[PDB]
C-alpha cells in the first residue's frame, strides 16, 4: 500500500555482469542490514566470466558495492590414483545468494567437475558448488555435494542410477532458522532433480581447501526414482521452507518441479527426511508451475500459506484464443491434520508475455494492519513491457485480487525488473519492512522503502 516509488535507491554492478540476478538481505552481528547481490556473469581477475558476489551497505544514495571475494582459481588434486578437477569458468557464481545469521551462501550452479583415471573419466559435468562466507571473520568454506569419483563406464553398467554429475547444486537455495542449508539441484539423478541439505556449521567445520572430495557426515540427499512422472521434472528448480504438518519441532520443505510429469509441473511439500506430505499439480502444460514458490501466512491465522507461480500460463480468451500472461496460485493452510486443498485464489497476469508470477516475495506486514503481504513480479509486464512488480495485501479471506500498488520498472527494456525480489526486512530502521528488486539485464537493484 505504501512503498515509496519516487524516492528509489539504485545499486549498480559492472556491465554484462547480471548484477541483481539474485539478492538477499544480510544482517551482521551488530544488527546492521546490508544487501547481498549475486552477479553471475561478472568477469574474474583473468577476464574470463566466473560470476561474483557483492555486499552492499545501506545508503539512500546507493551506488557501487564492494566485492565479497571468493577463490576463483581452478583446482587439481592427484590422489588415490585419480585426478580430481574443478572448473570455475562460466560457473555463474551468484546465480543464487542466500543469507543466514552471519553467513552468506553464494552458489555457482554451472561450476564443472571431472575425475580422470588413466584413459577414462567421470565426464566434465556441471555438478554445481556453493561458496560459504562469514564476512566479519573472513572464514570461507565450500559445499559441493554432487561431486563424485565414479568413472563413466560404471554409470553405463548400472543404467545411470544415482547419477549426480549434472546436479547444478545451488541452482536454488534456502536456509532454515536452525541453520540447515537446503540446495535445489534440478539436474540431479539424470535431470529428475534432487535436494541436498547439511547444517551450515558442519559445512564450515568439515571443509579444508584443496581436498575437493570430502565428507559432510550430517548431510542428507533426496532420492532417485524410476517413476517416469519425475523424469526431466527439474525437481529443485525452486525451493522454500515452512511449517505445514502442525509439529513445530519439525520443518517442512517446499520443492518446485516445473516440468514434472511431461511438463505438467508440480510443487511438493515434504518433511525433512524427503517424504512427500502433499503434491500440488500444475493446471496447464508448459506453464512452468513451480518456477517460483513462496511461503507466508497471509490470512492471519498463524498457519503458513503457500504461493506457487506459473509464469508461462496461457489464459483463455474470446474465440478459443490463448494468451500467455502468467499465473500465481494461493493455497491457504487449513486447521488440524488436513492437506492443502484447491487454490483459495488465482492471480492471473494481464500483459502478454509478462511472465506474471516469475517471482513471489513475502513482504511481511507492509502496512502493519495485522496481515502479511506479498509482492509478485511480472518481469516483462506493464504496457511497455519494461517490467512490473505488484503488491498484494493480506486479509482474513486470503489476498485481494486487485493489487494495492503497482511498481513500474525505472530501467530500460530487457532489464528483467522483478526477476528477483526480497522483502520482510526493515533496511532503514523506520519500523516498516522494505522491498529490494533486481534488474539483472540492467545490472542494477532498486530499493523501495515503506512509509507511514
Amino acid at each position: 500500500l505504501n512503498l515509496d516509488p519516487v524516492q528509489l535507491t539504485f545499486y549498480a554492478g559492472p556491465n554484462g555482469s547480471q548484477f541483481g540476478f539474485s539478492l538477499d538481505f544480510h544482517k551482521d552481528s551488530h544488527g546492521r542490514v546490508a544487501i547481498v547481490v549475486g552477479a553471475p556473469r561478472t568477469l574474474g581477475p583473468s577476464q574470463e566470466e566466473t560470476g561474483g558476489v557483492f555486499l552492499c551497505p545501506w545508503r539512500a544514495e546507493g551506488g557501487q558495492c564492494p566485492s565479497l571475494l571468493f577463490d576463483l582459481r581452478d583446482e587439481t588434486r592427484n590422489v588415490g590414483s585419480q585426478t580430481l578437477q574443478t572448473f570455475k569458468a562460466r560457473q555463474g557464481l551468484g546465480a543464487s545468494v542466500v543469507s543466514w545469521s552471519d553467513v552468506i551462501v553464494a552458489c555457482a550452479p554451472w561450476q564443472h567437475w571431472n575425475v580422470l583415471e588413466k584413459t577414462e573419466e567421470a565426464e566434465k559435468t556441471p555438478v554445481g558448488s556453493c561458496f560459504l562466507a562469514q564476512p566479519e571473520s573472513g572464514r570461507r568454506a565450500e559445499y559441493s555435494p554432487c561431486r563424485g569419483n565414479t568413472l563413466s563406464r560404471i554409470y553405463v553398467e548400472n543404467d545411470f542410477s544415482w547419477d549426480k554429475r549434472y546436479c547444478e547444486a545451488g541452482f536454488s537455495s534456502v536456509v532454515t532458522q536452525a541453520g540447515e542449508l537446503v540446495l535445489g539441484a534440478p539436474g540431479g539423478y539424470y535431470f529428475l532433480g534432487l535436494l541436498a541439505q547439511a547444517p551450515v556449521a558442519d559445512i564450515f567445520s568439515s571443509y579444508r581447501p584443496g581436498i575437493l572430495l570430502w565428507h559432510v557426515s550430517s548431510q542428507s540427499l533426496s532420492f532417485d526414482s524410476s517413476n517416469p512422472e519425475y523424469f526431466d521434472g527439474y525437481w529443485g528448480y525452486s525451493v522454500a521452507v515452512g511449517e505445514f504438518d502442525g509439529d513445530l519441532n519439525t520443518t517442512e520443505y517446499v520443492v518446485g518441479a516445473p516440468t514434472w510429469s511431461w511438463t505438467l509441473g508440480a510443487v511438493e511439500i515434504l518433511d525433512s527426511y524427503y517424504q512427500r506430505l502433499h503434491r500440488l499439480r500444475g493446471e496447464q502444460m508448459a506453464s512452468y508451475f513451480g518456477h517460483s514458490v513462496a511461503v507466508t501466512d497471509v490470512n492471519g491465522d498463524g498457519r503458513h500459506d503457500l504461493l506457487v507461480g506459473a509464469p508461462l500460463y496461457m489464459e483463455s480468451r474470446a474465440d478459443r484464443k490463448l494468451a500467455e500472461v502468467g499465473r500465481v496460485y494461493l493455497f491457504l493452510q487449513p486447521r488440524g491434520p488436513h492437506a492443502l486443498g484447491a487454490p483459495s485464489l488465482l492471480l492471473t497476469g494481464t500483459q502478454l508475455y509478462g511472465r506474471f508470477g516469475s517471482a513471489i516475495a513475502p513482504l511481511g506486514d507492509l502496512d502493519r494492519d495485522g496481515y502479511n503481504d506479498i509482492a509478485v513480479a511480472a518481469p516483462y509486464g506493464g504496457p511497455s513491457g519494461r517490467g512490473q512488480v505488484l503488491v498484494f495485501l493480506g486479509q482474513s479471506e486470503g489476498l485481494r485480487s486487485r493489487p494495492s500498488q503497482v511498481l513500474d520498472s525505472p530501467f530500460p527494456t530487457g532489464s528483467a525488473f522483478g526477476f528477483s525480489l526480497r522483502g520482510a526486512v526493515d533496511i532503514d530502521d523506520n519500523g516498516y519492512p522494505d522491498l529490494i528488486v533486481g534488474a539483472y539485464g540492467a545490472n542494477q537493484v532498486a530499493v523501495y522503502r515503506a512509509q507511514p
Partner: antibody
Amino acid sequence: EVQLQQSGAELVKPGASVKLSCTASGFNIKDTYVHWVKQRPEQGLEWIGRIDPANGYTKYDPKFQGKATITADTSSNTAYLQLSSLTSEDTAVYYCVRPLYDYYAMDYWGQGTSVTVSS
Amino acid sequence: DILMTQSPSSMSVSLGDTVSITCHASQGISSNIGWLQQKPGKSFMGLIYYGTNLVDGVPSRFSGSGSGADYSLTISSLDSEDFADYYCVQYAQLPYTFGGGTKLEIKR
C-alpha cells in the same frame, strides 16, 4: 562419537579361513570408504584393500589379491575381511580404517583384531 | 608402488623438547600424506591429514609440513603421552603405503 568396533581375537589353523568384522558405531558404514590394514612387529603396516559399502566396489593390493575378500553389509552397519588359505604370514593384527573428512584419508581406526595361525 | 622411507627409526628425547620426524616418498605425492600415532599396546589415532590438517581433537602441539616428496611431523614441547610410535601413510596412489615407523623414547 565415531568408533569402529572390531571382532575379537582369532586362533585359527593353517590352510583354513577366518572372517573378521568391523561394526560402525555412531555413524553409518556406507558413509565412507572402509579400509583394511595389516600390522606385524617386523614387517610393519601393509594396506590390504578398501570397500565402498554404498555399492560394494573394492580395491586390493596385488599382494593380497586372492587371499583377502572385503565385503560390507549396510543392514548391520558392518564391514568384513575374509582371509582364505591361512599361513604363518597371516599371523598379524588387522585394523579397519576410515577417513574423517577427506575421501582418501586414513584417520579413524578400529581397536584391531589379532589373528594367530597355528597347528 | 610408492616407497615411504621414515627417519629416524627411533630417537631418544626428553619432556618439553621439540622434535621432527621426516618421511621421504619415492616420488611426489603433493601433500597426500597422513601422520598416525600408536601408543604402547594401543591402536592407532590419526594426527594429520592432507599434509598439514590436524584431525579433530588432536592437540595444537602437533604440526605437519613439507611438499613434493619430503614431509615432516613436528611435536612441540613433548608431553609424556607423546612417547609412542609414529607412522606416515601416503594416499597419492593405490596401493596406499606406510613408512617404517619412528619410536620416541625417554632419554636418560
